[PDB]
């Protein structure tokens, strides 16, 4: 009933019954207003919900909650390079925060049954080659557990 | 290079990846624990940096000041040393116990801070609907002692 949970700093036990609402956040501190930021978040699939339907649901939420949200592209995505790589989808989108036009990539994967793992890159400027390389190397370098 | 870089491996429950050195980790772990009470118990793990000339007790002092602003009827009930892990890798820190009113409901809060990663602070914050008694303190401090630093 106790099972291990790992963070960067070490590891501890949690009851099997827990729900993980952790959000990993990585920023270039002091230069947030020009630099991309990275985010990893977690979610659970609704009954009979597959990953495409999950992404549709999230797209509709962002249309609802964010400023003038617009999806720019949608394509397959992969986290890792081995036979155990996560196979999922990604979108690119923009939305408005005050004067700023925020640019985002988000990639969703079912890492274990019923549980979605979401990688997000957020930039205060349109994507450039540097941001694209960051995004693609981040996903390719991911090493799934187990 | 092929054997490593100034960039740093980073681990989450679901796997690991390389985090470029320029990034600061501001992750917030949130775990909703099992419970049938009106409010669920939860564990929060956050990361912080000490301000210039701020030690760990002073850091705790700063977090209490922020609690008073955001949480209804916040009262500190206890303050004591804390230990995360055991053996040579054990982390010596500090902790508080406190109460506040989440809604119309009284809940019970622990916060324990440590210097796990050199030059950073790791903060465990427990929110529970169940009052702290000797048994609860035992189970909490025993759980802290079981932490295995990386």
Residue numbers in the entry:
A (entry chain B): 1 to 146
B (entry chain A): -4 to 145
From the paper:
Crystal structures of Eag chaperones in complex with the TMDs of cognate class I and class II effectors reveal the conformation of effector TMDs prior to their secretion and insertion into target cell membranes. Given that the Eag chaperone dimer creates a hydrophobic environment with complementary knob-hole interactions for its cognate effector TM helices, and interacts with TM helices via side chain to main chain hydrogen bonds, we conclude that Eag chaperones provide an environment that mimics transmembrane helical packing to stabilize prePAAR effector TMDs in the cytoplasm prior to effector export from the cell.
However, the EagR1 homologue SciW from Salmonella Typhimurium crystallized in isolation and in the presence of the N-terminus of the class I prePAAR effector Rhs1 (Rhs1NT), allowing us to determine apo and effector-bound structures to resolutions of 1.75 Å and 1.90 Å, respectively. A comparison of the chaperone structures in their apo and effector-bound states shows that upon effector binding, both chaperones ‘grip’ the prePAAR-TMD region of their cognate effector in a claw-like manner.
